[PDB]
Paper text:
We investigated Aβ40 fibrils formed from this monomeric Aβ40 in the presence of negatively charged liposomes composed of 1,2-dimyristoyl-sn-glycero-3-phosphoglycerol (DMPG) by magic-angle sample spinning NMR spectroscopy and cryo-EM. Indeed, the three lipidic Aβ folds are identical in the central β-strand formed by residues Q15 to A21, with only minor differences in the sidechain rotamers, but they differ in the conformation of the N- and C-termini.
The high-resolution cryo-EM map allows us to accurately model residues D1-V40. L1 is also dominant in the NMR spectrum (vide infra). Following NMR assignments for 37 residues, NOE data revealed contacts between the phospholipid acyl chains and residues D23 to G33, the hydrophobic residues L34 and M35 as well as part of the N-terminal β-strand (K16-V18), identifying the additional density in the cryo-EM map of L1 as lipids. Furthermore, we observed additional interactions with the acyl chain (Q15-F19) and the head group (D1-H13) of liposomes in the L1 fibril. Indeed, hydrophobic surface patches are formed by the L1 structure that faces the hydrophobic acyl chains of the lipid molecules. In the case of L1, extra density is located between Lys28 and Val40, extending over 3.3 nm, corresponding to the combined length of two acyl chains in a DMPG lipid molecule. In contrast, the C-terminus in the L1 fibril adopts an extended conformation in which K28 interacts with E22 and D23. The L1 fibril also reveals a compact N-terminus due to inter-protofilament interactions mediated by V40. During molecular dynamics simulations of the L1 fibril, we observed that the hydrogen bond between D23 and K28 breaks but also reforms, with the hydrogen bond being present in 52 ± 1% of all conformations, in agreement with the peak doubling in the NMR experiments.
Numbering used by the authors:
A (entry chain A), B (entry chain C), C (entry chain E), D (entry chain G), E (entry chain I), F (entry chain J), ...: 1 to 40
């Protein structure tokens, strides 16, 4: 008379999660508000 | 008289999740608000 | 007299999820609000 | 007298999901609000 | 006297889903609001 | 013996120029690359 | 014996120029690359 | 014996120039690369 | 015997220039690379 | 025998220049690279 229940609400085996964020709100280039040249 | 229930609400085996975000709201190029040249 | 139930509400085996977002709201090119040249 | 039920509400085996988004709301080209040249 | 039910509400085997979105609301070309040249 | 020449190559009096561009390459509505719902 | 020449190459009096660009390459609405819902 | 030349190459009187750019490459709305919901 | 030349190469009187750029490459709204919800 | 030349190469009287740049490459809204919720 055995029972053997395995009711683990969440069972996870060999899970591999990678969350990668790169370059979020980053500036790798020029941002210039104004360029003014040769103004008389 | 065995039972053997395995009622794990969520059972996950060998899951591999990759969430990749790149270049979200990023500027890799020029943003210039104004260029003004040769103004007299 | 065996039973052998396997009622896991969610059963996942060997799932591979890739969520990839690239270049979302990103500027890789020039954005210029105004270019003004040769104005007298 | 066996039973052998396998009523997992969701059963997934060897699923591979790829969600790819690229270039969503991204500018890879020039956007210029105005170009004004040779104005007297 | 066996039973052998397999009533998994959703059963998925070897599913491969690819959702690909590219170039959604993206500008790879020039957008110029105005070009004005040679105005006197 | 008067002369009174007025040879101005370009003579402009009381000119009013309005160049208006609105909504050029602009999205005021939804753009969705894919909607997928209820897929099994 | 007067002369009175007025040969100004470009003569401009009371010129009013308005160059207006609004909403050039701008998104005021939603852009979604993918919406995926209820996928099993 | 007067002369009275007024050969100014460019003569400008009472010029009013307004260059306005608004909302050039700007996002005032949502841009979402992916929305994924209810995926099993 | 007067002369009275006024050959100023560029003559500007009462010029008013307004260059306004607003919201150039600016985000006033949400940009989300991915939203993932309810994934098992 | 007067002369009275006024050949100033650039002559500017009562010029008013306003160059205004606001919100150039600025984020006033949320940018989120990923939101992941309810992942098992």
């Amino acid at each position: 008379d055995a029972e053997f229940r395995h009711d683990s609400g969440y069972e996870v085996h060999h899970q591999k999660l990678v969350f990668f964020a790169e370059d979020v709100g980053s500036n790798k280039g020029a941002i210039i508000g104004l360029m003014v040249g040769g103004v008389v």
